[PDB]
A paper describes a structure:
Cryogenic structures of HG3 and HG3.7 in the absence of a ligand revealed that β-strands 6 and 7 (located adjacent to the binding pocket), adopt two distinct backbone conformations whereas only a single conformer is observed for HG3.17. Estimating the respective populations from the volumes of duplicated cross peaks shows that the inactive species comprises ~25% of the HG3 and HG3.7 samples at 25 °C, but only 5% of HG3.17. Because the sparsely populated inactive sub-state of HG3.17 was not detected in the cryogenic X-ray structure, we set up crystal screens under conditions favoring this conformation (pH 10 and 37 °C). The other 15 mutations in HG3.17 had a relatively small effect on kcat (3-fold), but increased kcat/KM 10-fold by lowering KM; they also largely eliminated the inactive conformational sub-state and decreased product inhibition.
Here, we investigate the molecular origins of the nearly billionfold rate enhancement achieved by directed evolution of the computationally designed Kemp eliminase HG3 (7). The Kemp elimination is a well-studied model for proton transfer from carbon that has served as a benchmark for de novo design. Although the first-generation HG3 design is significantly more efficient than an “off-the-shelf” catalyst like bovine serum albumin, its specific activity was further increased 200-fold over 17 rounds of mutagenesis and screening. All HG3 variants have an inactive conformational sub-state, rooted in the original protein scaffold, which was gradually supplanted with a catalytically competent sub-state as evolution progressed.
Author numbering: 2 to 302
Amino acid sequence: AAQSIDQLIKARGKVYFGVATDQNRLTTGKNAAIIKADFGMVWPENSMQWDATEPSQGNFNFAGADYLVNWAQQNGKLIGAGCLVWHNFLPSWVSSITDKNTLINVMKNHITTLMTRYKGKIRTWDVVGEAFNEDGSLRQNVFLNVIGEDYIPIAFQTARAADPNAKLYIMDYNLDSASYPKTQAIVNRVKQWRAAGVPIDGIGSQMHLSAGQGAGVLQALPLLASAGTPEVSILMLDVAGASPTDYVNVVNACLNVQSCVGITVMGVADPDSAFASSTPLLFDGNFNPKPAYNAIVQDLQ
């Protein structure tokens, strides 16, 4: 029978099945109805990014973010938000800053202002994103180049102070094989950071997958969970071709990792995906559940 994957994953002891969205999606088509029926958590695709919220220094705006947070409260959904510190959606005024202390203070103020506005309401903040190169070294974004590698400690310490009850995550992509240097490096660095007292509660795996990659996640996710964070999660999930096999493998990986709290997909219906031609989502363009959705339902019985 037609069922909600969020309700089913909750019945298997996980916290949520979630989806990325924003005001532009919710005011059109069938998105809001499907999200309400089948998902338990929303995340803003773009409205909480740096460009949207702080387009010039100290001059904040929350139009889209408030829309989504208020919608989630109104509609009984959990909220995740981010990314506080990454190189995407980063307005050039930030990446033009040339000195350590200036950028520290700008970064701290950005983190604190966003987290304070929504204090107590947000389950998970993605504090640091896409911090690694594929070889496992740290990505030379403006934060690393100007602050240095202490930017990661600082970002998490600041986030904990702004809202101690949010779960604080680092997230990255291409963490999908236990044999890949990037997956190994984020584990080694998170272990280091935690031993130094950096408050990293979660590793989020950004699973923008090609066909056949699901199987590798079965061993990659427990490797990520070995860094000792209280949580791991799957986010930004889509799969080229949307094979039931790939989706069921990802779900099984989360089921088999005690610290995996849930799974968030990148969107609702295929033609609205940034990767629409790969039909990589769980609903087709008529907003009907696809074979992969039905396979997830079957797998969560």
